[PDB]
Design a protein around this ligand. Structure first.
Ligand code: ZN
Ligand code: ZN
Length: 431
């Protein structure tokens, strides 16, 4: 039994791992590369998409399912297993990536074909391929997110997929992995533990009351798949003490994803499921409004506060958010609230460096609005959480993370008596 890293090696995008065991070929995730690696979605997989017997998807994020339609474009016709939640989100994620893509490396025919082979596989349901047994464990990272347990040939392998930040309230805690002979694990934040959740929420509420009370705007860059709805959830459960103000989810996609949540009630934490039981959707704070088109979106720029605005892209690469930033950053009464990791050298970091001005949409804009970074809303397990999850596991191969971050984590694993390496592209490892 061998596992061959075919992406996310010494990097964060491109998650795709081929499992060779029991005389079968099972692909674990099939994400696209993103950002600077984006061009590599055009390059070949490094394996034959026709010899694959079946593929398992840990979750709907584009960096785990984005190359799936390419797998089908190039021949594959096997089954694609994923939890109902991932299956349903996957549709919104792929359609969108298609419509919003410069150099598309697949077409509508491939998305359709790909979605056509999705088969529901919930947690604790065993899959049988040859003499190989595979099951999903709770990863608590996205509704329907899971880690993979592959047992066969007398051995056990565990692919973590992306592990969640167990401190937040929306998703159920990540389950412990079973004792395994080999663990393929992410290490996005292998270099440090994250800021505590409760304290980030309090701080968040402090920021809201202050700027909303003075008639200012609270601008929030958010990814549309799950971070946006988590913010609305915090806004919903604390709406009793926040000043009245319209909440604009200025993101069609975030909207489509949100409309889907009521159907995924069983995929949330007990806290969230208990709210739905009371008969009320905890992801729709009072005053919520999903903005569908550009005209109303831009009208928000010249309208006065108080208001809360959630918009993408989550890392200021593009999206309506730039238009809000452009027109709101120069007003001292407004506040910018980052609820996620800002890439090095990006407009995010540049703003945090707090210069006298910033360049947004071909224009220099005075930066007077207050700026706040709430690291606590982070969606991946931090270093300390990675350690606990990995406790007692004999061997560990690291993927999904920048080199230095995988190393810092590697160090601690090593000093703990655990054997570890940094998965290399194309180089398989013995389970
Ligand atoms: Zn993810
Ligand atoms: Zn990922």
């Amino acid at each position: 039994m061998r596992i061959v890293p075919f992406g996310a090696a010494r990097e964060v995008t491109g998650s795709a791992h081929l499992l060779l065991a029991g005389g079968r070929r099972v692909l674990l995730d099939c994400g696209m590369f993103q950002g600077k690696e984006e061009a590599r979605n055009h390059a070949p997989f490094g394996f034959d998409p026709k010899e694959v017997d079946a593929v398992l998807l840990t979750h709907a994020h584009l960096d785990h399912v984005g190359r799936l339609p390419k797998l089908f474009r190039e021949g594959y016709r096997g089954p694609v297993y994923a939890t109902r939640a991932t299956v349903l989100l996957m549709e919104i994620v792929l359609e969108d990536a298609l419509k919003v893509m410069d150099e598309p490396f697949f077409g509508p025919e491939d998305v359709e074909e790909a979605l056509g082979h999705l088969r529901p596989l919930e947690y604790g349901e065993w899959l049988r391929l040859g003499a190989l047994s595979l099951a999903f464990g709770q990863a608590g990272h996205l509704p329907g997110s899971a880690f993979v347990v592959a047992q066969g040939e007398g051995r056990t392998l565990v692919y973590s997929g992306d592990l969640g930040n167990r401190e937040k309230d929306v998703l159920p805690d990540p389950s412990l992995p079973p004792l395994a002979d080999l663990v393929l694990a992410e290490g996005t934040y292998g270099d440090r533990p994250h800021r505590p959740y409760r304290e980030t929420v309090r701080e968040f509420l402090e920021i809201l009351e202050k700027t909303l009370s003075q008639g200012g705007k609270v601008l929030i860059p958010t990814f549309a798949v799950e971070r946006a709805q988590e913010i609305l959830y915090v806004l919903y459960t604390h709406g009793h003490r926040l000043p009245r103000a319209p909440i604009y989810l200025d993101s069609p996609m975030a909207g489509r994803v949100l409309s889907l949540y009521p159907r995924l009630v069983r995929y949330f934490s007990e806290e969230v499921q208990a709210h739905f039981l009371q008969g009320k959707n905890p992801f729709r704070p009072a005053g919520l409004e999903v903005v569908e088109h550009t005209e109303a979106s831009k009208a928000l720029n010249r309208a006065p506060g108080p208001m809360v605005v959630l918009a993408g892209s989550g890392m200021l690469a593009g999206g309506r958010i730039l238009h809000h930033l452009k027109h709101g950053l120069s007003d001292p009464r407004n506040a910018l609230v980052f609820v996620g990791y800002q890439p090095q050298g990006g407009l995010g970091a540049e703003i945090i460096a707090r210069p006298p001005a910033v360049r947004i949409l071909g224009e220099e804009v005075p930066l007077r609005a207050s700026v706040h970074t709430l690291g606590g809303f982070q969606g991946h397990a931090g270093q300390d959480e990675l350690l606990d999850w990995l406790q007692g596991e004999p061997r560990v191969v690291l993927v999904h993370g920048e080199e230095e971050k995988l190393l810092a984590l590697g160090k601690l694993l090593a000093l703990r008596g655990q054997e570890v390496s940094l998965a290399r592209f194309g180089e398989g490892v013995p389970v």
